Amino acid sequence: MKQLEDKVEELLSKNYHLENEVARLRSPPLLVGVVSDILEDGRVVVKSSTGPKFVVNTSQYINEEELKPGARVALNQQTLAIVNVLP
Amino acid sequence: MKQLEDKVEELLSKNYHLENEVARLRSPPLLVGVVSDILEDGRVVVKSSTGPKFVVNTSQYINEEELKPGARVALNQQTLAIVNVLP
Amino acid sequence: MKQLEDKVEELLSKNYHLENEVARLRSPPLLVGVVSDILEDGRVVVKSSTGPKFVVNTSQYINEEELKPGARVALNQQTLAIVNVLP
Amino acid sequence: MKQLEDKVEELLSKNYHLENEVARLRSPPLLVGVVSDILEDGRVVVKSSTGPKFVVNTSQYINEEELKPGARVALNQQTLAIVNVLP
Amino acid sequence: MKQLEDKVEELLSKNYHLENEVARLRSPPLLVGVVSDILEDGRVVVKSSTGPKFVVNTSQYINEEELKPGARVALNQQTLAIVNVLP
Amino acid sequence: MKQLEDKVEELLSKNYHLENEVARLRSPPLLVGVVSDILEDGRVVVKSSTGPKFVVNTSQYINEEELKPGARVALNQQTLAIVNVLP
């Protein structure tokens, strides 16, 4: 009776940890690039680590002071929008 | 009590499906990469042997001690999440 | 007159949808390229920063004066049409 | 009354120019390559600007006198058939 | 006899569809490659002009005499099967 | 009458040879790589001829004695599992 209740407890714990592993292993990556130049309209030219250069948007949460040539950036993999400025 | 036995069966069915999903996410073929640096929030910058650099998530079962710059890693091919540190 | 008011509403709905379609076609992320040469029929040969060269179409809103060999261009990622000349 | 009629006029004009921009920005590009060699059966080996070499068909409208080694060509992006010989 | 005439029509319809399927499989665009070596079981290692090396199947209509290391080949783009030896 | 019967015969022959050509031209290729290193758990790190390195499984029919660094391997194109060790 309490044996069952403990099993429910450990199973709930196990299942939570597994759900967490799934969430971690399915999260999309961000792509790394380097800022090349900033355009008069607030779009940024990034050189992606994949090779090409793109004109991309920037997250609204980004301190645009940090965006300057040579700055390392992390990009949404689909839109290539700048999500993080990296150290 | 019958409620409990039923809950245990439900939870084990759920556990079983989560285990299979995790196995698939962690199964070969895995892409090889090299850790570039570790971010404050615990995401990792890896250089993939495909060429580009990514900010990625990690399995919760990695030994954090071995997760350091220059470490060789096995990455989920789709998300590039770090599944294992390699020797 | 009611016929007219109805036509105006129809046309504005259509205008609205066309504007959105054009905004999507012109939105970041745009690939960067360089104009290689301009063909007699007004198509352009660009070298994409992805590597290959293409004969592409252009937006009708480009200043033809700046569209010349060596100019840097923002290309629709799918068709490589020239959306903007860049500085 | 004539105000409405003028609006219909300008809207029809605006909508036409938008439709044109859509058509221009959705037209597929042609891929540039260089003729490598011509085969005894009228197929051509082209070196694409994407890297590889292919055996391709040629448009029926092409003056085959113009097809010779070193000649720059424009290819249908899907079939890689030679569509234009470029200057 | 009517059974026979019917069988002939059936078989010719089937022949027609197989011929079209084979024509499609052998039609341009074909990737160019170079034979690297011939395996005991008669599969061939080719180096594709795309870069990688493959173990591939071959058309039964290839002259085996010309199928040898260094020979230039036309490959199905999807399977990289050898469709023709090229001069 | 025997004319028909002979036609059925030759058509059946023709159709068989066409079916064979389809089967040969549709068979997937194997990708060539080189063994890089063998892991303590029986997974192998392969350097694919496409460029990247992967951790892959190995066919159960493979003599694991033959798997050693430098060994040339043929891989299932989708799973990248080692299917053959090549001379």
What is E50-82 written as a DSSP string?
TS-EEEE-B-TTS-TTT-STT-EEEE-TTT--E
Amino acid identity for residue F54 in this structure = F
Residue A14 CB: number of other CB atoms within 10 A?
16
- Round to whole Å and give the CA distance between A70 and A57: 17
Is A57 in Cβ contact with C30 (below 8 Å)? no
Return phi, psi of residue A54, to 5°.
-135, 155
Residue-wise burial string across A39-67, b where 16 or more C-beta atoms lie within 10 A, e elsewhere: eeeebbbbbbbbebbbbbbbeeebeeeeb
Residues 6 or more apart whose Cβ sits within 8 Å of residue A79 = A56, A57, C28, C29
- Round to whole Å and give the CA distance between C30 and A56: 7
Structure tokens belonging to residue F29: 């290729």
Nearest to E40 by CA among F85, F81, F82, F26: F85
| CA distances in angstroms from F85 to A40, B14, D44, E37, F74, listed in the order given | 57, 40, 36, 14, 6
- Round to whole Å and give the CA distance between D20 and C22: 10
| CA distances in angstroms from D46 to D36, D55, E25, F17, F26, listed in the order given | 5, 6, 20, 32, 24
Which CATH number describes the domain made up of C1-29?
1.20.5.170
CB B14, CB B46: distance < 8 Å: no
Return left, alpha or beta for E23; rule: phi > 0 is left, psi -120 to 50 is alpha, else beta.
alpha
Burial class (CB in 10 A: 0-12, 13-18, 19+), F79: middle
Return left, alpha or beta for F42; rule: phi > 0 is left, psi -120 to 50 is alpha, else beta.
left
- Round to whole Å and give the CA distance between A87 and E87: 56
- Round to whole Å and give the CA distance between A31 and A12: 35
Structure tokens belonging to residue A33: 């690039």
Residues 6 or more apart whose Cβ sits within 8 Å of residue E37 = E44, E45, E69, F87
Helix, coil or strand: residue F30: strand
Is A55 in Cβ contact with C74 (below 8 Å)? yes
Amino acid identity for residue A43 in this structure = R
Amino acid identity for residue C52 in this structure = P
Residues 6 or more apart whose Cβ sits within 8 Å of residue D6 = none
Size of interface C-D (CB pairs under 8 A): 94
Amino acid identity for residue E41 in this structure = D
Amino acid identity for residue D51 in this structure = G
DSSP percent split of chain C into helix, strand, coil, nearest 5: 30, 30, 35
Residue E79 CB: number of other CB atoms within 10 A?
19
Residue B51 in contact with partner chain F when CB distance is under 8 A = yes
What angle do the packed helices A2-26 and B2-26 form, to 10 degrees?
30
Residue in chain B closest to A8 (alpha carbons) equals B8
- Round to whole Å and give the CA distance between A71 and A69: 6
Residue C68 CB: number of other CB atoms within 10 A?
12
Listed in order, strand segments (DSSP E) in A3-81 are 30-38, 44-48, 53-56, 72-76
| CA distances in angstroms from E25 to D42, E53, E72, F30, listed in the order given | 19, 20, 19, 18
Residue E31, min C-alpha distance to chain D (Å)? 5
Residue F84 forms beta bridges with which residues? F74
DSSP assigned state of D58 = B
Return left, alpha or beta for E51; rule: phi > 0 is left, psi -120 to 50 is alpha, else beta.
left
Mutate to test the interface with B, among A14, A18, A24, A46 (most CBs of B within 10 A): A24
Nearest to A80 by CA among B39, C76, C28: C28
Chain B touches chain E, with at least 3 Cβ pairs below 8 Å, answer no
**A31 CA to centre of own chain:** 8
Structure tokens belonging to residue E34: 């170079």
**CB nearest to F51's CB, from B28, B30, B50:** B50
Mutate to test the interface with A, among C31, C34, C83 (most CBs of A within 10 A): C31
Burial class (CB in 10 A: 0-12, 13-18, 19+), C35: buried
Residue B27, min C-alpha distance to chain F (Å)? 9
Residue F31 CB: number of other CB atoms within 10 A?
22
Contacts of B32 in chain F (CB under 8 A): 45, 52-55
Structure tokens belonging to residue D1: 């009354």
Chain A touches chain C, with at least 3 Cβ pairs below 8 Å, answer yes
- Round to whole Å and give the CA distance between A82 and A40: 17
Helix, coil or strand: residue C49: coil
Residue-wise burial string across D19-52, b where 16 or more C-beta atoms lie within 10 A, e elsewhere: eebeebbeeebbbbbebbbbeeeebbbbbbbbeb
- Residue D28 CA neighbour count, 13 Å, CB half: 11
- N-terminal to C-terminal alpha carbon distance within chain B: 49
Q: What angle do CA E53, E59, E60 make, to 5 degrees?
A: 135
Is B29 in Cβ contact with F54 (below 8 Å)? yes
Nearest to C69 by CA among D27, D87, D67, D51: D87
Residue A82 in contact with partner chain C when CB distance is under 8 A = no
**Does a cis peptide bond (omega within 30 degrees of 0) precede residue E28?**
no
The architecture CATH gives domain C30-87: Beta Barrel (2.40)
Nearest to C10 by CA among E1, D4, A72: D4
Residues 6 or more apart whose Cβ sits within 8 Å of residue E64 = none
Residue D28 in contact with partner chain C when CB distance is under 8 A = yes
Chain F touches chain A, with at least 3 Cβ pairs below 8 Å, answer no
- Round to whole Å and give the CA distance between C59 and C36: 17
For chain F, the farthest-separated pair of C-alpha atoms sits apart, in whole angstroms, at 70
Q: What angle do CA C57, C30, C40 make, to 5 degrees?
A: 20
Structure tokens belonging to residue F2: 């025997």
CB F44, CB F62: distance < 8 Å: no
- Round to whole Å and give the CA distance between D35 and D30: 15
Note the resolution in Å, 1 decimal.
Answer: 2.1
Residue-wise burial string across E16-43, b where 16 or more C-beta atoms lie within 10 A, e elsewhere: eebeebbeebbebbbbbbebbebeeeeb
Nearest to A45 by CA among C68, C29, C85, C79: C29
Residues 6 or more apart whose Cβ sits within 8 Å of residue A26 = B25, B79, B81
Mutate to test the interface with D, among E50, E54, E83 (most CBs of D within 10 A): E50
- Round to whole Å and give the CA distance between B87 and E23: 50
Is F55 in Cβ contact with B28 (below 8 Å)? yes
Amino acid identity for residue A37 in this structure = D
DSSP assigned state of C51 = S
Return phi, psi of residue F16, to 5°.
-60, -45
Helix, coil or strand: residue E8: helix
